[PDB]
Amino acid sequence: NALLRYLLDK
Amino acid sequence: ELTPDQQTLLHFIMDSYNKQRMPQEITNKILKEEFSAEENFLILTEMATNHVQVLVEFTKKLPGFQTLDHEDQIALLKGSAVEAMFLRSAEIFNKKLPSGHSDLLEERIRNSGISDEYITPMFSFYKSIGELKMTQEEYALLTAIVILSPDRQYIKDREAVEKLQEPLLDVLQKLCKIHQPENPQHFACLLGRLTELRTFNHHHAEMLMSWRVNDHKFTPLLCEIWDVQ
Numbered sequence: 201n202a203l204l205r206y207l208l209d210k
Numbered sequence: 211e212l213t214p215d216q217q218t219l220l221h222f223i224m225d226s227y228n229k230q231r232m233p234q235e236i237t238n239k240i241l242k243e244e245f246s247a248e249e250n251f252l253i254l255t256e257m258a259t260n261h262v263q264v265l266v267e268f269t270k271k272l273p274g275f276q277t278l279d280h281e282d283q284i285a286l287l288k289g290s291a292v293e294a295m296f297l298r299s300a301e302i303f304n305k306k307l308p309s310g311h312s313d314l315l316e317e318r319i320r321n322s323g324i325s326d327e328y329i330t331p332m333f334s335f336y337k338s339i340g341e342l343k344m345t346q347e348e349y350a351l352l353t354a355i356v357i358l359s360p361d362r363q364y365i366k367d368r369e370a371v372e373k374l375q376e377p378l379l380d381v382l383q384k385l386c387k388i389h390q391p392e393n394p395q396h397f398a399c400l401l402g403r404l405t406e407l408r409t410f411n412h413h414h415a416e417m418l419m420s421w422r423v424n425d426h427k428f429t430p431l432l433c434e435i436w437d438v439q
């Protein structure tokens with residue numbers, strides 16, 4: 201879930 | 211008739227909900243591209259990708275959402291994607307398209323490899339929400355409520371999500387009592403449309419299942435959000 205985490209944090 | 215703390219919350223939500231838009235390049239395709247099944251599906255892939263991009267941006271700004279455990283944040287996002295997308299796509303079908311483009315969008319959805327068994331209840335949902343002439347307020351709050359649902363699979367702290375959700379349900383309820391006093395049942399009926407939203411988790415899974423037999427392809431974000439692997 202690295203992509204969803206990235207989109208959550210940016 | 212809304213406490214000041216409820217006014218603040220309402221304004222945060224609407225602010226956040228409104229700075230999301232359907233890009234013009236995608237709505238242009240609805241008119242301009244040829245009407246083949248290959249091109250129809252490609253456009254839906256773009257709308258879907260955009261719905262999910264928009265879901266995330268909305269989610270990350272929801273009050274208290276940063277305070278939740280990181281794993282649960284992801285379980286919410288994935289738990290909610292289908293329900294939130296179908297709702298948004300309803301707002302778009304009814305309200306954020308010029309007059310003739312419902313009919314075309316519809317014609318594309320009707321020739322993109324989706325069974326009538328999923329189409330019928332989809333368009334029946336779109337019809338029924340349009341006849342309710344659902345407000346922007348309503349779309350927005352309802353969307354926040356779906357996202358912060360404590361009922362999704364894999365949430366470790368269901369209570370923490372319930373504490374973010376409750377305030378949203380109280381606002382929406384008061385808005386109903388206020389803006390629709392001749393319909394005391396309004397709040398219950400909006401909750402009834404949430405109950406019908408939950409129906410699409412099953413449908414969408416089936417829809418993705420049929421597309422995958424014909425080897426259609428999906429984007430990185432979409433495969434990730436729905437565990438298509």
Ligand SMILES: C/C1=C\CC[C@](C)(O)/C=C\[C@H](C(C)C)[C@@H](OC(=O)c2ccc(O)cc2)C1
Nearest residue numbers: 254255257258261295296299332427428432
């Ligand atoms: C049925 C579609 C669009 C009209 C709205 C609808 C019917 O509520 C459902 C779903 C979305 C819309 C948001 C565009 C799209 O459905 C998908 O989820 C999808 C996912 C990956 C993919 O490669 C193609 C589509 C296509």
